[PDB]
Structure formats: C-alpha cells, structure tokens
Design an enzyme around this catalytic site. Structure first.
Site, mmCIF file in Angstrom:
data_model
loop_
_atom_site.group_PDB
_atom_site.id
_atom_site.type_symbol
_atom_site.label_atom_id
_atom_site.label_comp_id
_atom_site.label_asym_id
_atom_site.label_seq_id
_atom_site.Cartn_x
_atom_site.Cartn_y
_atom_site.Cartn_z
ATOM 1 N N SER A 290 -5.666 -4.608 15.006
ATOM 2 C CA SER A 290 -5.066 -3.931 16.161
ATOM 3 C C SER A 290 -6.118 -3.587 17.204
ATOM 4 O O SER A 290 -5.863 -3.728 18.398
ATOM 5 C CB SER A 290 -4.338 -2.666 15.702
ATOM 6 O OG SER A 290 -5.247 -1.745 15.140
ATOM 7 N N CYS B 95 -4.166 5.830 1.190
ATOM 8 C CA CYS B 95 -3.725 4.613 0.472
ATOM 9 C C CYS B 95 -3.436 4.735 -1.024
ATOM 10 O O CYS B 95 -3.643 3.776 -1.775
ATOM 11 C CB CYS B 95 -4.750 3.494 0.695
ATOM 12 S SG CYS B 95 -4.979 3.202 2.492
ATOM 13 N N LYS C 148 -12.020 -5.660 2.676
ATOM 14 C CA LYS C 148 -11.394 -4.750 3.643
ATOM 15 C C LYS C 148 -12.391 -3.673 3.964
ATOM 16 O O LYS C 148 -12.613 -2.782 3.119
ATOM 17 C CB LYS C 148 -10.172 -4.089 3.046
ATOM 18 C CG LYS C 148 -9.166 -3.747 4.074
ATOM 19 C CD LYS C 148 -8.131 -2.804 3.518
ATOM 20 C CE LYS C 148 -6.736 -2.988 4.111
ATOM 21 N NZ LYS C 148 -6.614 -2.684 5.524
ATOM 22 N N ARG D 239 -11.212 6.504 5.215
ATOM 23 C CA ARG D 239 -10.961 5.701 4.043
ATOM 24 C C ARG D 239 -12.235 5.181 3.442
ATOM 25 O O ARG D 239 -12.218 4.241 2.664
ATOM 26 C CB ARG D 239 -10.045 4.528 4.413
ATOM 27 C CG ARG D 239 -8.761 4.945 5.121
ATOM 28 C CD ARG D 239 -7.737 3.795 5.129
ATOM 29 N NE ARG D 239 -6.542 4.132 5.896
ATOM 30 C CZ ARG D 239 -5.664 5.082 5.544
ATOM 31 N NH1 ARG D 239 -5.835 5.788 4.420
ATOM 32 N NH2 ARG D 239 -4.632 5.366 6.333
ATOM 33 N N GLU E 138 -16.857 -8.466 -3.286
ATOM 34 C CA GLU E 138 -15.502 -7.926 -3.253
ATOM 35 C C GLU E 138 -14.447 -9.008 -3.404
ATOM 36 O O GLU E 138 -13.514 -8.857 -4.185
ATOM 37 C CB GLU E 138 -15.265 -7.154 -1.939
ATOM 38 C CG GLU E 138 -15.616 -5.684 -2.032
ATOM 39 C CD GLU E 138 -14.642 -4.887 -2.946
ATOM 40 O OE1 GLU E 138 -13.551 -5.411 -3.272
ATOM 41 O OE2 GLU E 138 -14.945 -3.733 -3.335
ATOM 42 N N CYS F 99 0.810 -1.217 0.000
ATOM 43 C CA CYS F 99 0.000 0.000 0.000
ATOM 44 C C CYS F 99 0.865 1.300 0.000
ATOM 45 O O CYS F 99 2.076 1.246 -0.275
ATOM 46 C CB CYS F 99 -0.890 -0.032 1.245
ATOM 47 S SG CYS F 99 -2.425 0.815 0.983
ATOM 48 N N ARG G 189 -2.771 2.331 13.028
ATOM 49 C CA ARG G 189 -2.291 3.585 12.429
ATOM 50 C C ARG G 189 -1.202 4.236 13.313
ATOM 51 O O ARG G 189 -0.226 4.798 12.798
ATOM 52 C CB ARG G 189 -3.484 4.519 12.174
ATOM 53 C CG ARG G 189 -4.291 4.045 10.950
ATOM 54 C CD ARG G 189 -5.519 4.885 10.651
ATOM 55 N NE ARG G 189 -6.272 4.200 9.618
ATOM 56 C CZ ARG G 189 -7.509 4.490 9.259
ATOM 57 N NH1 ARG G 189 -8.160 5.488 9.845
ATOM 58 N NH2 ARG G 189 -8.108 3.738 8.345
ATOM 59 N N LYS H 217 -11.145 -8.509 6.579
ATOM 60 C CA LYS H 217 -10.592 -7.617 7.600
ATOM 61 C C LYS H 217 -11.516 -6.433 7.881
ATOM 62 O O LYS H 217 -11.995 -5.766 6.953
ATOM 63 C CB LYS H 217 -9.213 -7.111 7.178
ATOM 64 C CG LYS H 217 -8.624 -5.900 7.951
ATOM 65 C CD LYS H 217 -7.212 -5.584 7.381
ATOM 66 C CE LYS H 217 -6.879 -4.135 7.308
ATOM 67 N NZ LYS H 217 -5.919 -3.686 8.289
ATOM 68 N N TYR I 104 -1.514 -10.365 16.282
ATOM 69 C CA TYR I 104 -0.392 -9.703 16.956
ATOM 70 C C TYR I 104 -0.020 -10.504 18.210
ATOM 71 O O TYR I 104 0.970 -10.204 18.874
ATOM 72 C CB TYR I 104 -0.752 -8.235 17.348
ATOM 73 C CG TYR I 104 -1.036 -7.311 16.183
ATOM 74 C CD1 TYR I 104 -0.020 -6.895 15.341
ATOM 75 C CD2 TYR I 104 -2.337 -6.935 15.887
ATOM 76 C CE1 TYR I 104 -0.298 -6.118 14.197
ATOM 77 C CE2 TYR I 104 -2.635 -6.175 14.754
ATOM 78 C CZ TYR I 104 -1.620 -5.768 13.899
ATOM 79 O OH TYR I 104 -1.954 -5.072 12.735
#
Ligand SMILES: *[C@H](CCC(=O)O)CC[C@@H](*)CCC(=O)O
Ligand SMILES: *[C@H](CCC(=O)O)CC[C@@H](*)CCC(=O)O
Ligand SMILES: *[C@H](CCC(=O)O)CC[C@@H](*)CCC(=O)O
Ligand SMILES: *[C@H](CCC(=O)O)CC[C@H](*)CCC(=O)O
Ligand SMILES: *[C@H](CCC(=O)O)CC[C@H](*)CCC(=O)O
Ligand SMILES: *[C@H](CCC(=O)O)CC[C@H](*)CCC(=O)O
Ligand SMILES: [Mg+2]
Ligand SMILES: [Mg+2]
Ligand SMILES: [Mg+2]
Ligand SMILES: [Mg+2]
Ligand SMILES: [Mg+2]
Ligand SMILES: [Mg+2]
Ligand SMILES: [Zn+2]
Ligand SMILES: [Zn+2]
Ligand SMILES: [Zn+2]
Ligand SMILES: [Zn+2]
Ligand SMILES: [Zn+2]
Ligand SMILES: [Zn+2]
Lengths: 323, 323, 323, 323, 323, 323
Positions: free
Chosen positions: B272, B129, B194, B215, B231, B119, B204, B246, B311
């Site tokens: 996150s 993006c 997404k 976005r 999609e 990206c 971020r 996501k 994570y």
C-alpha cells in the site's frame, strides 16, 4: 507445537533486534547532490522536489560551508546554465559553471569531497547528453567533449569526475584525457549502469534540462539485468574507481548482482523521482517521512551499496537523525 | 575512438530495444488485493490509497465479476470486520467474514483463483496478528487458530491459504490442519519473508487494523538479508507451494537472492505504501503514473518475482495497459 | 498418503497453470528468414520446406511490407544467385544481390530490422562457404572477402552483419572492416556456435547451395559441447553484439550452457530440417502442427534463447497465434 | 590474419575429428519400447509411427528373442488392453497383461533387462492415468493402485518398475509397496520429469490410450524449467534408482540442468512424436533418416543422458549402425 | 608511469578513506564477559588480565547497572564457585550461583540481554567441563546436566543459554530440555566451534577453573579447519540461534569460512589470552592499546562476526571510544 | 542420548588427534627477518622486541652462517641506515647497505634464500616509503627508484626483490627494471596486500624508521577485505612470483579469501607487534610462549599461507621445536 527453529526468538525486544541487525547506515554513506544556478540572486524552490532549492552561485560558498558543517563528507555538483548552446561547450570552459562550482567548493572546504557531474544535458540547447548529429547523440564526438570537461573540472579541484552521459567508452575517454593532462590522481565515479528511467522528471525540473524527447538511445533499458551488469563491468575494465547503479530504489536486485561480480566500490543514486514519491506521500499524510526515508536508504545499503547519492542527506545530517 | 564493444548498438531504435528487452510484464503476473467490508452499504474510499475503496460485502459478487471480466486471474482477500474480539475468532467461524469472502468469489466466478489472507490483525480488538499473552503475540496459540481459520477458508473455496501472521511454523501448522480435514489439495501461499516495514500505513487504514504498537516481535527486521532468505527456505521446507517477499519495491535484492536459492514460485507484494507514494507523486504532477507503475512492476519481475500483488492491477487491466 | 509437497496443486486448472507458467513466447522473439531470388518472375515453392517459397526480387518490396505489416520485427536475408563464380564475389559487389536485398528492405520498411546473412556458399560455383584453395576452404582468404561483403551490406542498410561461414576470426575480421569503413554502429549477429549438422538439407534446396561434399572442416562437431561454448566465447571476445546456437532444436543443452557463460544476447536458429520435420509429420496427420510449433519455439526460449530464427514466424504472425 | 586460436585446426580431417569427438553413442545407451497387444493374432502397423507394430502377445516370446539377438540390452513394455475398466485393474491382476508381458520376456530371455511401464491410461475406459473422482485423476487412490501394480509386475520378473502416471509421491508409494512384498531389490525407473507434451499423439495411437481430454492436471508444464528439476529431485529423495526427462528431444536444456543437480543415472525418452517427425520427413525425402537419427540420439547423450528410450533401437541394432 | 588502476586514489585523505571504509565497528557488536564470585566481599584483581576483576555477588546489582549505564547491551556470566563438587551440581541448583547471576542481572536491568555461560569447569572439583568416568569427561552424563542447568538458568531469567562444554549434541540436549520445561522462547548461543586452545590461561585464573590436565578430548583441534565448520553446522542443525568461533583473533579464516556456510548469526570470542597479549604489550609501551584494540576488534567484524565477546567492551563504552 | 555423529570420537587420545590433524607446520614454512646495522660494533637489543637485536654488519657473515646452520632456508633483509637523505638513494647505490646485506648473505651461504626488503622508509630522512613531493609520497617517482634498487639488489645476489613501499604498479615497475638489466630470473616477493596497521611500532623501533606521521595514504585500510583481494590480484596480474598478506595474525580471513582466488604462492607476515604481544604476555607469565607461538604460526598455515615471515624462526630452529 514442536519447532526447534524459531526466528522470533531474536525479535523479542528492541535490544535483541539491535544486537542482531545485519545492516547499518551512517551519515558517511551519503553523498549530497547540490543544484547551483549561475547569474541569479534568490534561492529557487524546485516544485517537483519539496524542500530542494537551486543555490545561487553567489551563495554556494555559504551553502557548502553549511553542508560541510552538518557533517556531509561529499557532494555531487549540478549546474543550471544561462549559457546553453548546441554543443554544451560552457561545460569545458576553464571558467564556466562546471569549473566554477568545483573551484568554489574546494576553495571553501578543502576537505570536502567534490564529485562533479560530467555531462551536457544541462548546457545544451536541445537538452541531450552530448553532440546531436544526423544520427542522434554522437557517441564519439561526445566522448571528445567529456574528456575536455574532465580536465577543466579536475583543474578546478573536482575529486571525482562523474560521467552521466551514458556514452560507450566514456570512462576510458575521461581516464586518458585526465592522465594526459597530469591529473592521473583524479578519480572517476562512473554512472556505470544508468537506466533510461521515468523517475528523473523532478531532477530535470530542478536542473533545467531542456529535453523534449527521451534518452533511450544511450541510457539503458530498465528491464535488462544482464546488460546492466555488463555495463558496469566494461567500466571497471576501463579504470573506474567507483561504479554506480542509477536509479537505486527499484533496482536493488541489480545492486546485489553487481556487488557479487566486482571488488570495486559501488554507488547507488536515490533519484529525484524516488525523493518526490516519499515527499508527496508524507505531505498527503500517507506515510511517516523519516521512517520511510531511513528504511529506503537502509535497503539500498543492505543491497550492497557502499555510497548513496541522496537529496535527504543534509536534513538527515542537521536533524542529527544520522551521524 | 577505438571501441569494438558499443552497448548503444542495440539501443538505436524502438524495434531494436524491444527485440533485446530481457524482461516481460503481463497481466497474468498480477494478483489483485481487494478489501471487503461486511455489514455495510456503500463503497468507502481509502484516503491514504487514492483509487482504492472498501467493497461492501453485498456488492462483492458484482465486483469479483467486474475484476474477472477485466482479465484479472486472481485476488487476495482482506476483510474489514464488525465482529472483532480478543482472539479474532470471526476468522475461523465457518461462516465468518473470512469464509464468506471466499465463498462469494468462488461461487460467482468459479475460475477465479482466490487467495485468502490468513491472519487476525483485522479481527482482533488489539489489532495484533494473533493471540496476546503477557508475552506479546503468543506464537503457538496463534498457530492453532491459523490452522482453524485455514480449514474454514479452504472449505469456503479458497484456492490458496496465505498466512501473513509472521508466526514461526505457520506453514507447517496450516499444512497439517488442511491435510487432516481433507484439503490436501488446497495450496499455501506463504508471506514467507514479511518485514516489519513502515510502508503498511495505508493498508492498515484500508483494512481497519486496530493496532496501536508495532509488529517488530514477529515481522522481521528490514535490514536482515541473510535472515530474510532463511525465513523463506524454512517455509519451503514446511511445504509451502509459493514463497513471497513483502514489501517488494525496496527489497528487490531479497527477491533476487531468494530466486537463486529455491526452484519454488516466488510472489512479491507491491505494498500500500508503494502504491501511495506513486499515486500522490502523480497527483502532485511530479511523475507520470503509468510510466512509473509499469517501471516499478517491471523491476519486480526483473528481480525474479513470478507473481506480483498490486493495487494497480484492475486499472492496468481495464485501461488495457497490460494484457 | 502423507505427502506435504504436491507439485500437482498448481496444475489443477488452466488459470493456475497460466499463473505459474515460467516461460513465455512473444512474436517479438521471432526473426524471419527470407529467401530472395534475383532475375526471376514467379515465387518458387521449396519442396523440402512445405509453405516456404523463394520471393522474386521484383516482389521483395511487396513481401517485406507484408511481413512488417504482420508484426514481424526482423528478417534474415538469403539470396538465390544467378551470378555464381569461384570466389562468390557477387556477394561483395556494392550492387549485387546481398546489397540489393538489404537496400530494398530498409528502403521499403525503414524500421525493419535487417540481418543480412554473410557467407558465400550461395554465390560460389563449388557451394563452399568461402575461397577453395589446395587445402580446403581457405580461412584467411575467406576472412578478407567476409569483411568486404560486410561493408557493402552495411552500405546497403543491413542492421546486423551475420557471418555464417564458420571461419575462425570472422567476427574480428568483420568488426575491423566495418569500423574502418565508418560503420562502427553496424551490429554483428555471429552464427558463433554453428554445427556441421545434417538438418540443413531443406535450406540448401531452398537457397540453391551448389555443394556436393560437406562443411565438416569449418562448421563444428555436433558432439562437442565444450568446444561449442568456446566457439561462442571467442566471438564474444572479438566483439559480437549477439551470439547464436545453430541448430536450436536438438541443442538446447548448448543454449542453456552458453546462457550461463555470457551476458550477451543469445540467438537460436530453428533450422530448415526442424521445420520440415514438423511440416511433414503434420501433413501425415501424426501431430498437431500448431501445438508442436508452439511447444518447440517455447522450448528454445525456455533453454535461454533471446531471439529465435524461425520459418513459421509469418504464419504465426498473420494467424494471430503470437503477438 | 593474426589468430593464435584457430578452432578449425582440429577439424582438418576425419581422423582428427574422431580423435577430438567429445561424446560417444553406443547400443548400450538404448532401451527399446515395445507394444504388445493381448488376445490378438497378427502384428498391427502403427500408422502414425511408420515401422512400428503392435506385437501379438502370442508372438512376444519370438520378438523378445529377436530383440535380444540384435544386441538390445533392455526393453520398456506397453500393453494394449482388451480388459479396460474404470480403475484399470487388469494392470494389478497377478496375471493381467502387465504381469504377463514381463513374465514372457524374463522367461524367454533371462538376461533381458525388462522395464515395465507402470500406469493405467492403457487399462482405463476413460484413458486417464489413474482413478477418476469428481476431482479429476485422484492422486492418492492412484498411488495405491500403482503400488499394487508394482508388486505383480515385480513378481512377474520386471527389473524396473517405471511409474509414468505423473502422480505426486508415486516413487515413495511404489518403493514402500515393493519393499513390504519382499521386492526390496526391484528397481524404480521414474519418469520423474514428464511434461504435458503434444508429442505423444503417435504413442497413444500405438498403445490404445482411450483419452478424450488432456493430462495437464498431472503431467507438468513444458515451459517450467525450475519445476522440472524439482520434479526429479523429489523422486531422487523418494528412492528412485534412475530419473528421466520426457520428452527428451526438445528438453535437452532440462537434461543438462538435471545432470548438474544429481549423481543419479538419468534416462531420456525420444518420444513417438520425435520418431514420427524424423520418419515422415525422411519419407518425404527431405532429410537423411540415419544421419538425422544418429545426430538426434547423439545430442541426447551429449546433453547428459545415460540411457535413451528409442523406437529406432532395433533397426540401428540389426543394421549394425550402432554396436 | 602507465597505470589506469591506482588503488591509492581513494587513500589520499581521511575523508576519502572514511567514505570507502568497508567495515564498521560499533558498541552493539560487543558482548561483555563478567566474572562474579559468590560468598565474597571485595573485588579481586585478575593478575593475568590487567583491568579485569572478579565482581563480588553482593556488588553485581551495582555493576550490571554500571555496565548498562555505559551502553553495553549484553553480558556473558561466569561465576567463581565456593560450592564445587564431583559433578558441578551447584550449576543446576535452582538457586545456585549460575541461576543467581542471571536473576540479579535481569531483575536489576530488565533490558540487559543476559547470556549465561553453560558448563561445569567452574563448579567441578577436578576442573573439567563435565562428569568424569574412567573414560574421561563422559559426554552423555554431561548432556543431562547441561540440560538441567539450562532450565534453572532460563527460569532465572537468562536470555541465552551458551553451552561451552564442547559436548557432542549439547545444543539438541539443551533445546529439548528448555522446550519441555516451557522455555521454548529461551535462545541458545552455542560455542559451536570451540578449539582446545592455549590462549585460555588468563580466563581460567579469572574464573577459578581447577583443571590440572587439558581439554583436548572435547574442545577441538586448532589445526582442523574442515572440522571447525562441521562443528558449527551440526549445531545449526540442532537448533542453535547463534553460532560462535572461539578463539576469534587467530581464527579469522574460520569465522570467514563459516560466514559463507550459514545464514545464522555468528559470534566470535576475543579470548582472555588475546586481551592479555594486548594489555601487557601496551604496558610494556611497545604498542598503542587503543589503536591495537580497535584494529583487533575491527578485523573480527571484517571477517564476518556479527557479535564480539570482548573484555575491553566497558572501557571502550565508558571512554566513549565506541558508541 | 541418541547421536550418530560424534566429533569427539577422533579426539580420544593424542594418537587419534595426531592422525586426524588437518594442518602441519614445518621449519620450511618459515622465513627469518634479519636486522643489519652498518657502521656499528656491538649487537643492539630492540627493546620493543624482546630477544631481537640488530646484527652489526661486521658480524652478518657470522649470523647468516648461524641462521643457515640452524636450518633456516630463507631470510628477509632490513637495514638500519647511517646515510639517510631526502630520497633514500643509498638504497640504490650499487654498494650501499641494501646491496651489501645481500652480497654478504649469498657470499657466505650460497644456498641461502635471500629476500631483500625493497623500500626507502629506512633510508629517508623523513621516514616515508618513497619520494615526498608537494602532494605526499610520489607514487611514480618512487616507482623509478624502486626499480633501480631492484637491479642493484639483484646485482648483489638477492633471490627475491620484496617491494614493501605500497606503491601502485610497484610489481610491474620492478619486473621491467629487472628484465631490462638481465635479471629476468630474479623473483618478486610482493608485499601485495599490506595494511596501514598499528602493529608495526616494534619494527620501526628495530629498523630506525624516522617517520612522525602515518602511511595511510599508500598502505591500505585494515577494514577493506574486498580491496585487500584486489590489491593482491593486481600484483598477480603484474607478474609477482609470490603474494603476501601483512599483517598475518589479525588477517587470516584475508589469507583464506586470497587463497581461494589465486594459484600463486601466498606469504604471510607475522609482524613485530604480534611478536611483542606474545613476548610481553609470556614475560608477565600470562601465557606459555611456546604453545602460543606454535598455535599462532599454525593458524597462519591453516588459513592458507605457504610461507610465514617470523621473528621466532631461529629460536624455533635451534631449540629443535620445528624441523
Ligand atoms: C543521469 C540522469 C539524469 C537525466 O536523465 O535527466 C544523471 C542524473 C541522475 C539523477 C537524476 C535524479 O536524481 O532524478
Ligand atoms: C548456416 C548453415 C547453412 C548450411 O550449412 O547450408 C547458415 C544457414 C542456417 C540455416 C540452415 C537451415 O535453416 O537449415
Ligand atoms: C612494511 C611495513 C613496515 C612499516 O610500515 O613500518 C614492511 C615491513 C613489515 C614488517 C613490519 C613488522 O614486522 O612489524
Ligand atoms: C502483512 C501485514 C500488513 C500490516 O499491516 O502489517 C499482510 C498484508 C500485506 C499488505 C500490506 C500493504 O499492502 O501495505
Ligand atoms: C508417458 C505418457 C505418454 C502419453 O501418451 O501421455 C509414458 C509414456 C511415454 C511415451 C510417449 C511417446 O513415446 O510419445
Ligand atoms: C570456553 C572454555 C574456556 C577454558 O578455560 O577452557 C568457554 C569460555 C571461553 C573464554 C576463554 C577465554 O576468554 O580465554
Ligand atoms: Mg557504459
Ligand atoms: Mg517464517
Ligand atoms: Mg568461430
Ligand atoms: Mg513427480
Ligand atoms: Mg559440537
Ligand atoms: Mg598494490
Ligand atoms: Zn546528461
Ligand atoms: Zn496480520
Ligand atoms: Zn555458407
Ligand atoms: Zn499413463
Ligand atoms: Zn567448561
Ligand atoms: Zn617502507
């Protein structure tokens, strides 16, 4: 480039996105879980649940008017008991906390939809959802008691009898008991697919559930999607008016699968652990509480839920975020 | 009571529950996202993501070795740029941060599968993006640049080119580009579905994305389940080797619907925001982190995901909680 | 050439193949069939089954501890009888071999999941799976006896009563008998779809089944896929907790079809003939035993089986090949 | 007992069982694989495949006549090369072994349907299914050669070109090639779903495949059921006249899933390994070969296969066991 | 009576009925059709559509402001031409009525989503939806002109180009045209399933369509449900951003079948005829207009429509009946 | 242009369109609702329903001959009562209006298919469809009375007993009552899915229904498509011979969905409000009555209806528009 199909075309302005939004969320989709504590005077904050407080029984008539005035159409009653014992018998006392919570709500706001949580883990000295026997929680002894509780809750005015004991045949047991007592019109909001989740810690703190072990021998395995559907379809077969997936948040695949397997209304419980996780990340400044709450409740609706049990409901109501 | 069907029969013991558990979670289901910051000397802590730190480029050889030693089979690279500009051109510089994160991983650990985030939000001065125009993010200007970045990252050793720009036709663009430059064997892991989610704040912060607005003109609407499937199927049609949902935690209905609509592998990103809500609730002592992480990751598996971006992967790996 | 779709991309390294492997096999998926012979002293090798031996009853307490220590969670008990007669009545003797095998297993390893094979072909002088009458094997007379055996096996501690007699209504018969005797919690592992196969020769040698004709009048036709599904769905309807396809190896189309027709757990029996065929080709040096065993058991899981009955289980366990 | 449904009703006699048998197996369902070794004089026995022998090229006219006399309607040719090299170029030599095996079969028995195995593992010095590069087996270098081999074999009289290289785009490559050279009528029998199985040892012995490593970078993973279907549907899309699952014995779930996903003919290869396990178990006297072969072949038919590749076809044909 | 299932249970009260209402109707579901007449001074009443008036071009800036003030998110423009001719060329004149209706709407209310009706029946002297030939309306002559009109309207600011000519290939033609002229981002709202209905009389009056005959050679047959789906799926294949069923009121079966056949947005046009039947029946005092309009619009939503074209949208918006 | 697919090809002439018309409508598909008023002399026009008139009981023998002579095969009888009371008991008087209407029809035209509307809203002083109790309309007290009415209507000769009371279990109640009385051959035309519509105003005027509130507590919610299907499937389960969707016009999505969920015949009621809307727009000259009626009835058939209840039936019959 050459692309005929361009998804982005309908994402260009807020107006376009609003026109093409597939799912919507209203205040109507929400049911408010309320914690009522007998024999106390001051509202008690639930630490694990930032913003939630036990309502003193003496103040319930006042809170239910507050809730109803905010536009909330329904509540789910949970009591904090001061008369616990080995079988949780205060739950079927025609005048115990369970009967009383309903009585007060229906007396205060006749049009309020009162769903009475139906179990014993809050009324038993051991904290289990029924009768403990040599074996573990006794399914059939507990079915007996779930039926008696049903009749006194219906007697007190509860609109839905909501079994959360995760006992086999509980819907059938409650339906026969209600019918036999002349409550053939009282509805059953079955906690039909209820997982042995690790997300109920805050709730147990809030409700005073005196349990030291787990409920893995009745509440079902989080990993079993096939079994989850079968749990709900068995309840449909036994006459439930409404089914439910609990927890909701990390089970939207289960909600969607069930949606496609029944014509019955489906409820989804945004459990205390999910509420705590949103509340504590917001207080740590990690996320925007409102945006995250609305996105989460919106996802639950998108997955196929007709009603969502949510502790954020009254705030959403009063702050006019949802109408 | 009369019940021939008793679901609790297979819940009586830990052995019986294990024997009938439908879903399994292992370490190979996990892909570990890593943040690498160039031109810097010490590890930086990510405030909003407790336990997560920017890895200094100089220490990446060391860390990818540690990660690989732990049993992690794969990583997704995100660089924190000190060379941002109008178009995010550092990303397609043969030796820009994007190409070097891959190069250092593949050269240090040849067996490590390296997925390279693809990206410009981490390399553009405006934080968006892609290429800006009076229009907003210009789709086709961006596709060319995604293509250019794809080839340098591929040349640098990346095993997967993972376009997360949410540009229409991005997979075709990147497929055409890699092919022409002789990387016909390099794979595409498309962030096919997404959503324009509010759960990316912590990320971020961790990745230094300089975005002031939103976005929503390119990442899709959270409420649109039918659009979400469309999609991903458009990306399967474009040649994508793996598809992805996501966020994953609040989109399990999407993951499951998609699983039933394709034979392709499907990845799911535990974002996150989800990581943040689990960590802060655990810090607040409201939930048990490990039990909640394992339940959360197991539900994503249950819903149909083949791979999970988490994570939590390294701690789960080093503490031998997953094997 | 120009190919956008390249399956080979995810097959390039062992790491990639591991990430994209769709099916997994654990030690948990396995159930170990055990042969126990009463009134004997030395373990007897079964020639037709290289590696298998009858366990002397006097050594069962020792073998079940061995099995449990290897990590095997469940066993299926088969006895070799020294008190055979025309009706196989030693099978319902509260103290006969069937009761005793269970008794010993549960007494020795309380947490061991004991599935008691439920039939008569090992206890009858004629070797048939029930009561022989002018007609052939008498379905209803055999149902009577299958119920009595069920109660004494449940009495002895068996966790699952597994009817393998291929008698119509056997699940219903066993469920009513168990319930009436206060064993409403004892599970039924029905050999629901059980074919009149030619792959049981080694087993009959191992179990001492004294039969000279065939079981074609009760066990079903190998060629009937439609009938196979209906056999299992009838058992689901009569209350079985778990269904089963026997044999497994040359019937994975039946396993997959049944998987898509029920939410119930499905067992698959890797029969003695399948074991012999792997063992004898390995001894002739034609194949790699381990690779072929793992591929075969893996195929059974891939086809949809939740549990696999396998004679290779303890070796796999002890040699740490499966965990 | 009370049972209106009694499945055993249609199992009472041999006549009733035959009348209700759902699946049929005949000789026309079988394709016979043959191994022909060039520049040699005596038949060579295949150790790992009892009963199978390399046929000397000089004696092929004799054998294909014998085969055809037996009632066999078709064969699949595999040559054992004495002209191996780096690229396996003997296979595309107008008069190489590949072209001559076909020529001798079609000229001796004009009615014989000849399927020509189309690969390089039997002609390459390294034993791999194609052109090697630093990469591993080079997909597109191999496709060109498969094309070249297709036309010489087609020119030699082969009725089907059966690519078993497990190369992406092999069907399209071979379709384009035959078409351009004027063999628009020559058919393709694609080994569309070819797993990286451990059951091919005996075959490699019989066919002289000089491979030291494995074929996992191109033959697909045994555990991947969704990938297996995708593999075959990509070949149907490429023009394949017939699709195929290999191995067949332990992949009946695949065959059945595929049968439900296409209207195309589906072949199933009963591999050397399966043949070996049946023969050695029969030699060891553990099973009845004939009953086990007929059951095994009947299950492949039952699962959805239209044609079965079996090394037992000739004996079954000459001993008049199948007509 | 004995009834465990009682549907009336959730119908007892207004609160219960609202909680279980499956479908919702809001103002964002509505698109408002507007008639603009050029070269004129006063609003003209449409006789056959009580409450509807031609808006004088000079007053459009005023009206689109009023509309937008009311909460209407979108409009569909229909112009009444004073420049009709043989081919309807005023429609593709850069500053013809078609281009100016859009220009005045977008410039007055930049946020207003403007869908521009795209046809020639309002601009041709003969009243037909295109170029006439000895043939009847010439398909391909018309496609060129639809393309030309698409670009001028797009250039004028239209957000959607809505071809209502019922020409084969109209979407592809308009997609190709807009793309080439640089309007790759302009969307197409295709009247994909447009029946040759008898409910358009009032509309033709309102829009001045000079047609003497019928449109049966191009608008499709009302009786053809299978053809209706094929009509829309061919437009999805051609790139249409949104599909549509017209009429909607008497074609709810079509809308529902289509909803199950595509993931694309589906619009439904509540035609002038439906509007007329509701208004005159209400005028005659036979029905309650508001309750009937809300029920009618709610059923179109219920059937699967995402957007509804309604002449009632402004009154519903200003009288705050929908929000 | 280049278009291979051209829908317009089969729309070129009236002949082609006739050949390819998918749905047809005959006089046979229609059922004629008739209004009969006891104790009166002159036919009374129903103002809300232009063209409809109450038939004086003294003239019924004459009208039913008229109807039958026009070719109408069936009628639905509705009476206007002069002996209303609190329970609507004249409806089960072996000689009251309901019995009499049937008696006269069957006596006059033996072959006439007489469907007797079965409710009480036309015979009760309060205008409700049953017994009013403290609660609202008493479901079970009304079931009792619906059964008694059934037997006297069957006694009078009614061919179908049509419950329109929207009482749970009504089909079961009527089926047991009919059977017990020796009317096991009398059919039930259940108004299975009957919405609490706002389109019945004209009918209530025509039938003299004395109701001031609504029927929202029994007739179902217009917005609930899932519940609509379940309402009809419950009736199928209770033995209805024919199901029904009422209203039809704005519910064809419900008709189509039900069509796909049952093998039972499905009726659709073109209600009075739909008739009024066509009649009043035609009188205002807005539409062509005949074209609109035929299109509407044709849509109902296209949606899947086997029989349509329509007030336009006799005109259509006599004017030879339908045969
Ligand atoms: C079932 C689970 C309660 C428990 O197991 O403690 C009934 C209560 C559901 C809500 C729990 C929550 O909100 O966390
Ligand atoms: C049913 C079949 C036994 C028989 O017919 O002899 C129960 C035993 C299944 C296992 C047989 C085997 O492993 O071969
Ligand atoms: C049910 C509805 C009547 C009512 O609620 O008044 C039975 C009659 C159906 C026809 C009503 C009509 O034609 O409008
Ligand atoms: C998607 C865009 C992230 C964003 O910040 O918009 C690609 C990266 C996904 C990770 C986001 C997270 O973990 O929160
Ligand atoms: C597939 C590759 C065989 C191999 O040795 O890899 C084409 C031939 C199939 C026959 C194999 C067998 O019969 O075992
Ligand atoms: C379709 C053609 C209308 C016509 O008059 O043929 C495009 C416009 C639809 C609106 C028609 C209406 O509202 O009646
Ligand atoms: Mg349950
Ligand atoms: Mg995309
Ligand atoms: Mg059976
Ligand atoms: Mg392939
Ligand atoms: Mg069209
Ligand atoms: Mg009903
Ligand atoms: Zn509880
Ligand atoms: Zn980005
Ligand atoms: Zn037996
Ligand atoms: Zn090969
Ligand atoms: Zn037109
Ligand atoms: Zn009524």
């Amino acid at each position: 480039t050459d692309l005929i199909q361009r998804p982005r075309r309908l994402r260009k302005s807020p107006a376009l996105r609003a026109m093409f939004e597939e799912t919507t969320l209203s205040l109507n989709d929400l049911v408010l879980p309320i914690f009522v504590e007998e024999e106390i005077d001051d509202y008690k904050a639930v630490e694990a649940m930032p913003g939630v407080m036990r309502i003193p029984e003496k103040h319930l008539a006042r809170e239910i008017e507050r809730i109803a005035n905010a536009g909330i159409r329904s509540v789910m009653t949970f009591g904090i008991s001061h008369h616990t014992d080995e079988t949780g018998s205060d739950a079927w006392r025609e005048d115990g906390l369970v009967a009383r919570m309903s009585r007060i709500c229906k007396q205060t706001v006749p049009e309020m939809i009162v769903m009475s949580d139906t179990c014993f883990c809050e009324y038993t000295s051991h904290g289990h959802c029924g009768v403990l026997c040599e074996h573990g929680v006794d399914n059939d002894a507990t079915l007996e008691n779930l039926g008696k509780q049903a009749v006194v809750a219906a007697a007190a005015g509860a609109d839905f009898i909501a079994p959360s004991a995760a006992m086999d045949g509980q819907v059938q047991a409650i339906r026969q008991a209600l019918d036999a007592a002349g409550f053939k019109d009282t509805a059953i909001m079955s906690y039909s697919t209820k997982f042995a989740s690790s997300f109920y810690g805050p709730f147990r703190e809030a409700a005073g559930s005196a349990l030291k072990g787990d409920r893995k021998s009745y509440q079902m395995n989080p990993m079993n999607r096939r079994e989850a559907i079968r749990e709900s379809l068995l309840d449909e077969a036994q006459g439930a008016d409404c089914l439910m997936v609990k927890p909701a948040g990390a089970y939207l695949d289960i909600v969607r699968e069930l949606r496609e397997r029944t014509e019955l209304p489906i409820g989804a419980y945004q459990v205390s652990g999910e509420y705590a996780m949103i509340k504590f990340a917001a207080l740590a400044g990690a996320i925007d509480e409102e945006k995250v709450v609305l996105e989460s409740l919106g996802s639950i609706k998108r997955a196929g839920a007709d009603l969502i049990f949510s502790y954020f409901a009254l705030d959403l109501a009063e702050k006019k975020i949802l109408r």
